[PDB]
Amino acid sequence: VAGTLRLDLAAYRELEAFAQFGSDLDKATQAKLARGARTVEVLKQDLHQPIPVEKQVLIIYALTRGFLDDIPVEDVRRFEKEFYLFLDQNGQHLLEHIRTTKDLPNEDDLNKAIEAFKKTFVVS
Amino acid sequence: VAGTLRLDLAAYRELEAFAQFGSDLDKATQAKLARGARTVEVLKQDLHQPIPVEKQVLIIYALTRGFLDDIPVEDVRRFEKEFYLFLDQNGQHLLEHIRTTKDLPNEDDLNKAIEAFKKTFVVS
Amino acid sequence: GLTMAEYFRDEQGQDVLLFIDNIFRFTQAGSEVSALLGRMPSAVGYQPTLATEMGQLQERITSTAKGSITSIQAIYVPADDYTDPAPATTFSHLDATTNLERKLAEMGIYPAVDPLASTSRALAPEIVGEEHYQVARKVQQTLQRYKELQDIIAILGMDELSDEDKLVVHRARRIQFFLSQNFHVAEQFTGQPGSYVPVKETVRGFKEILEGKYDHLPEDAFRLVGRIEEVVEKAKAMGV
Amino acid sequence: ALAPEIVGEEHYQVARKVQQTLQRYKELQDIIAILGMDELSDEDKLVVHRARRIQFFLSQNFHVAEQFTGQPGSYVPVKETVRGFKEILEGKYDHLPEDAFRLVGRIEEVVEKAKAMGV
Amino acid sequence: ASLRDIKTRINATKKTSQITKAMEMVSTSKLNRAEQNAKSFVPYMEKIQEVVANVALGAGGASHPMLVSRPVKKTGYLVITSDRGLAGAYNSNVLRLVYQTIQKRHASPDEYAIIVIGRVGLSFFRKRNMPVILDITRLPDQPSFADIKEIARKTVGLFADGTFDELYMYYNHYVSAIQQEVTERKLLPLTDLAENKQRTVYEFEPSQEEILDVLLPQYAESLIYGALLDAKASEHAARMTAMKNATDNANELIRTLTLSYNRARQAAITQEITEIVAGANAL
């Protein structure tokens, strides 16, 4: 996931320098800006609260596959918190698979889990 | 012959408004850009091959008196190289007078030589 | 290292390659030695004898009748400052240069060589050949033209640009992504096996693309590819 | 001492938000100076509009300053300060003039000044 | 700060000044070409307004010139704004006037419907809840009659088809090369204008309900070269003046920053010399 995360950050960092002149330049720049903003919101955490590697990789995968592209940029933090709670409560099989084999679960089950969480997530 | 050359190069590039090229604005500036481009092309030189002062005078005079207004930029260099060879065979009296008196030859012969060479020249 | 290479040159009459890890550290050690010995610091604290020590190292790496020694030297540039005395004094001795860029490294383009800053004195029509020189000149011109248009696009949409410059952009994307390659030692980083490309293959592949033979192919098929045929192979693998 | 455990969640949030808006106002200053307030997006318009009033409200009238001015000083409790800054960040006072906020104490004094002068 | 920070800021200011100057030089030609385009339609407009002013005595033989209409069926608003920013107040002033007028006069949402030219206005009316229709996002730099002929036709048809009570219009008037004025205009129904000498209906077919039923839609559609050309002229002038101001401000920043650079580098030199010499002195 980190390989795609790097490019997603770099595109936004390149576009940010010209925001003063050209806005709504094209669909490509609009999508790049939205993805970069959600990336920045994801890469933000408070003091003395460490995160296990499996939860880190799950949230990064969820961001980089586009499941957050329909969430307002102001609510990504609360999305991450509620997603962590949901993963602890129900997706224990995926977490155990990651922790045991150092590899991602099958993308059908992971898509199912993310969709199931999104079906119950409430947006404000 | 140096004043017209200096002024033309100035108009071409010192007025850096002829350098950004965000649009056409070619009504008034087209002639200045054309002769400036021709000036820059004729001012180029190969590795070594220093050319004598009388031939320099001939080529600069031909540039300044509008004789290159119809020669394409891609062929300006080959025009010059053929012009020197034509001079070696036909403008010996012009070169001799320039060498002896440090002055320009009579405008009659000076114009006639270029007029003949232009007809002899092949556009492409 | 230099004397070990000079033995192979002078005695056995071979041809030798020197690979120097970093010259910036050589200059740093020189300045530290001078400061310890007690000499007054020169500009920005370097040793007074920087030029002489550098010349003494770099003069012995030359070719003579019995053999030749070529050397490839990696230089570190502190904080992107090319006016620092160490790079500024190593610039005098070199025959070719190569600027590597963080910006190109981030975009996934290895070996991240800046195609515009990189210069050499072997790029002459009489040395490498007329066709090679023409191709390289056209590549450089198209890349620089693309660079200029990018900031115009950044304030005025590409839908405003003229058709020919849009063609230039289209071809410049292909050229920029074709300059990248996969390496042998890149297996430990990616798993993709490397490649070796001859100079004739390079010049012909760049004569095409520029000619327009691969405009319909997508840009993502050109990255880290090797020979031109592999671009078509990847495009076929993607159905395009 | 600026931690949510010591000062409290509301105080911590309000202080961090004020710092964020002031940083954004600092960031926008160069383009404001070069090509004017005109090109700011509607988001930056609101950012600057809030930030200037916040910066002015940070000023205060001191008791020792009365030997330099005619205004007697003020002592402002922390709860009142938090309430006032939260209200400014909330958008209540978006219509008052900027100079109404200078050298006062509680946020009520701002409205009293905006009633003494103009409306 | 450091020489690094000072020189970085100076370089950024330099690049921005280059961009602004280039934009200005682009805009000058656009202003001149817009003026010489606006010069073209003037005789055609004079001819059509001469004919309509001749027939304007009317004697009531017309529909839409009938002044009154269904009370507050829908108020027509036509606003012309740029499709691209960097113009200063060119879009903001017009949109401000529009919002003031609608909120003070036709406050309820159903009392009105607004027509926009240029994507800035539609972005505005989608940012805030307003009933936008017939939006167009792209226009040529030097337009002609046929470019938005259909848009003009439909704007006319919404009042010709009884779906409006009346129609207003808002746009910047190119008062001068650097001075421009926002314009109020009651567009439909039509009102009086200046006079022309011809009064006799010498053309052979003179029926009012035959000449008018067809002349009036086209005279109303004349709004394209009536308004949009001067709107483009005002947009180009606003861009030119704004870029002038931006360049001046950038050069002032450059002079101030160089004035700081001088003291910075001077202190740096003094530090270098002092640090060397004080170490040399004691040993």
mmCIF file of N, CA and C in Angstrom, chain E residues 216-262:
data_model
loop_
_atom_site.group_PDB
_atom_site.id
_atom_site.type_symbol
_atom_site.label_atom_id
_atom_site.label_comp_id
_atom_site.label_asym_id
_atom_site.label_seq_id
_atom_site.Cartn_x
_atom_site.Cartn_y
_atom_site.Cartn_z
ATOM 1 N N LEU E 216 -39.628 41.215 -33.561
ATOM 2 C CA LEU E 216 -39.425 41.345 -32.120
ATOM 3 C C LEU E 216 -38.547 40.248 -31.533
ATOM 4 N N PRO E 217 -38.727 38.959 -31.857
ATOM 5 C CA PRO E 217 -37.781 37.962 -31.327
ATOM 6 C C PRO E 217 -36.336 38.249 -31.696
ATOM 7 N N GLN E 218 -36.079 38.704 -32.924
ATOM 8 C CA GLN E 218 -34.704 38.984 -33.326
ATOM 9 C C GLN E 218 -34.171 40.258 -32.677
ATOM 10 N N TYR E 219 -35.016 41.280 -32.522
ATOM 11 C CA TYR E 219 -34.580 42.485 -31.824
ATOM 12 C C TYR E 219 -34.261 42.183 -30.366
ATOM 13 N N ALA E 220 -35.055 41.316 -29.735
ATOM 14 C CA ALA E 220 -34.732 40.876 -28.383
ATOM 15 C C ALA E 220 -33.437 40.075 -28.361
ATOM 16 N N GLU E 221 -33.233 39.210 -29.355
ATOM 17 C CA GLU E 221 -32.024 38.399 -29.436
ATOM 18 C C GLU E 221 -30.799 39.244 -29.757
ATOM 19 N N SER E 222 -31.015 40.504 -30.142
ATOM 20 C CA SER E 222 -29.890 41.420 -30.319
ATOM 21 C C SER E 222 -29.089 41.615 -29.036
ATOM 22 N N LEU E 223 -29.610 41.144 -27.896
ATOM 23 C CA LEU E 223 -28.925 41.321 -26.619
ATOM 24 C C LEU E 223 -27.520 40.740 -26.636
ATOM 25 N N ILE E 224 -27.270 39.730 -27.472
ATOM 26 C CA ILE E 224 -25.940 39.132 -27.539
ATOM 27 C C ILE E 224 -24.884 40.190 -27.833
ATOM 28 N N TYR E 225 -24.965 40.838 -28.993
ATOM 29 C CA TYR E 225 -23.982 41.862 -29.302
ATOM 30 C C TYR E 225 -24.288 43.180 -28.606
ATOM 31 N N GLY E 226 -25.470 43.318 -28.011
ATOM 32 C CA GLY E 226 -25.709 44.456 -27.152
ATOM 33 C C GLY E 226 -24.878 44.427 -25.886
ATOM 34 N N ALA E 227 -24.775 43.252 -25.264
ATOM 35 C CA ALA E 227 -24.245 43.173 -23.909
ATOM 36 C C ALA E 227 -22.931 42.407 -23.846
ATOM 37 N N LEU E 228 -22.897 41.190 -24.402
ATOM 38 C CA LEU E 228 -21.770 40.299 -24.157
ATOM 39 C C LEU E 228 -20.460 40.861 -24.692
ATOM 40 N N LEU E 229 -20.504 41.643 -25.771
ATOM 41 C CA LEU E 229 -19.269 42.210 -26.302
ATOM 42 C C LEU E 229 -18.665 43.228 -25.342
ATOM 43 N N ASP E 230 -19.487 44.130 -24.808
ATOM 44 C CA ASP E 230 -18.983 45.069 -23.812
ATOM 45 C C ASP E 230 -18.607 44.357 -22.523
ATOM 46 N N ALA E 231 -19.279 43.248 -22.209
ATOM 47 C CA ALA E 231 -18.877 42.446 -21.059
ATOM 48 C C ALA E 231 -17.474 41.883 -21.249
ATOM 49 N N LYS E 232 -17.178 41.379 -22.449
ATOM 50 C CA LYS E 232 -15.835 40.886 -22.734
ATOM 51 C C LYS E 232 -14.813 42.015 -22.688
ATOM 52 N N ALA E 233 -15.180 43.192 -23.200
ATOM 53 C CA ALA E 233 -14.277 44.336 -23.132
ATOM 54 C C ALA E 233 -13.962 44.699 -21.687
ATOM 55 N N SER E 234 -14.985 44.728 -20.833
ATOM 56 C CA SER E 234 -14.767 45.024 -19.424
ATOM 57 C C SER E 234 -13.921 43.954 -18.751
ATOM 58 N N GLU E 235 -14.136 42.684 -19.098
ATOM 59 C CA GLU E 235 -13.337 41.609 -18.522
ATOM 60 C C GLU E 235 -11.865 41.756 -18.888
ATOM 61 N N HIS E 236 -11.581 42.049 -20.157
ATOM 62 C CA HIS E 236 -10.195 42.236 -20.574
ATOM 63 C C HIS E 236 -9.565 43.448 -19.895
ATOM 64 N N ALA E 237 -10.304 44.556 -19.800
ATOM 65 C CA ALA E 237 -9.766 45.732 -19.122
ATOM 66 C C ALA E 237 -9.489 45.453 -17.650
ATOM 67 N N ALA E 238 -10.392 44.735 -16.982
ATOM 68 C CA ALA E 238 -10.183 44.396 -15.582
ATOM 69 C C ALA E 238 -8.944 43.531 -15.415
ATOM 70 N N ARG E 239 -8.766 42.542 -16.296
ATOM 71 C CA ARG E 239 -7.564 41.719 -16.235
ATOM 72 C C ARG E 239 -6.312 42.565 -16.408
ATOM 73 N N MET E 240 -6.328 43.470 -17.386
ATOM 74 C CA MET E 240 -5.150 44.283 -17.664
ATOM 75 C C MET E 240 -4.776 45.144 -16.461
ATOM 76 N N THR E 241 -5.764 45.826 -15.878
ATOM 77 C CA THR E 241 -5.476 46.689 -14.737
ATOM 78 C C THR E 241 -5.043 45.879 -13.518
ATOM 79 N N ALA E 242 -5.680 44.727 -13.289
ATOM 80 C CA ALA E 242 -5.309 43.894 -12.154
ATOM 81 C C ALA E 242 -3.881 43.389 -12.285
ATOM 82 N N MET E 243 -3.479 42.987 -13.492
ATOM 83 C CA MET E 243 -2.105 42.544 -13.689
ATOM 84 C C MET E 243 -1.116 43.692 -13.535
ATOM 85 N N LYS E 244 -1.478 44.897 -13.979
ATOM 86 C CA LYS E 244 -0.636 46.060 -13.714
ATOM 87 C C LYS E 244 -0.386 46.228 -12.218
ATOM 88 N N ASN E 245 -1.465 46.217 -11.432
ATOM 89 C CA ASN E 245 -1.334 46.388 -9.987
ATOM 90 C C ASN E 245 -0.504 45.269 -9.369
ATOM 91 N N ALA E 246 -0.725 44.034 -9.823
ATOM 92 C CA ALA E 246 0.017 42.900 -9.286
ATOM 93 C C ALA E 246 1.506 43.034 -9.567
ATOM 94 N N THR E 247 1.860 43.451 -10.783
ATOM 95 C CA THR E 247 3.267 43.647 -11.114
ATOM 96 C C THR E 247 3.891 44.725 -10.241
ATOM 97 N N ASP E 248 3.176 45.833 -10.038
ATOM 98 C CA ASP E 248 3.720 46.897 -9.198
ATOM 99 C C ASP E 248 3.974 46.397 -7.780
ATOM 100 N N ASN E 249 3.006 45.668 -7.219
ATOM 101 C CA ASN E 249 3.174 45.148 -5.867
ATOM 102 C C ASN E 249 4.336 44.163 -5.792
ATOM 103 N N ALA E 250 4.487 43.317 -6.813
ATOM 104 C CA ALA E 250 5.586 42.360 -6.815
ATOM 105 C C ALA E 250 6.932 43.065 -6.844
ATOM 106 N N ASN E 251 7.052 44.121 -7.646
ATOM 107 C CA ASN E 251 8.316 44.845 -7.694
ATOM 108 C C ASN E 251 8.608 45.561 -6.379
ATOM 109 N N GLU E 252 7.576 46.072 -5.702
ATOM 110 C CA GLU E 252 7.800 46.651 -4.377
ATOM 111 C C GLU E 252 8.289 45.602 -3.381
ATOM 112 N N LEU E 253 7.675 44.417 -3.389
ATOM 113 C CA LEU E 253 8.176 43.335 -2.547
ATOM 114 C C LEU E 253 9.630 43.020 -2.863
ATOM 115 N N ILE E 254 9.982 43.000 -4.148
ATOM 116 C CA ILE E 254 11.349 42.669 -4.533
ATOM 117 C C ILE E 254 12.326 43.701 -3.989
ATOM 118 N N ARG E 255 12.001 44.990 -4.111
ATOM 119 C CA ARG E 255 12.939 45.995 -3.620
ATOM 120 C C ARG E 255 13.105 45.899 -2.107
ATOM 121 N N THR E 256 12.002 45.710 -1.374
ATOM 122 C CA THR E 256 12.109 45.596 0.079
ATOM 123 C C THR E 256 12.928 44.371 0.484
ATOM 124 N N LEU E 257 12.689 43.238 -0.171
ATOM 125 C CA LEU E 257 13.414 42.025 0.180
ATOM 126 C C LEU E 257 14.893 42.128 -0.160
ATOM 127 N N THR E 258 15.242 42.775 -1.276
ATOM 128 C CA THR E 258 16.658 42.991 -1.563
ATOM 129 C C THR E 258 17.293 43.907 -0.529
ATOM 130 N N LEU E 259 16.553 44.921 -0.082
ATOM 131 C CA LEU E 259 17.057 45.799 0.962
ATOM 132 C C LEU E 259 17.323 45.033 2.254
ATOM 133 N N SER E 260 16.531 43.996 2.537
ATOM 134 C CA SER E 260 16.838 43.133 3.682
ATOM 135 C C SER E 260 18.007 42.188 3.394
ATOM 136 N N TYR E 261 18.082 41.692 2.161
ATOM 137 C CA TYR E 261 19.162 40.804 1.751
ATOM 138 C C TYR E 261 20.516 41.456 1.966
ATOM 139 N N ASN E 262 20.603 42.761 1.706
ATOM 140 C CA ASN E 262 21.873 43.461 1.849
ATOM 141 C C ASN E 262 22.407 43.362 3.275
#
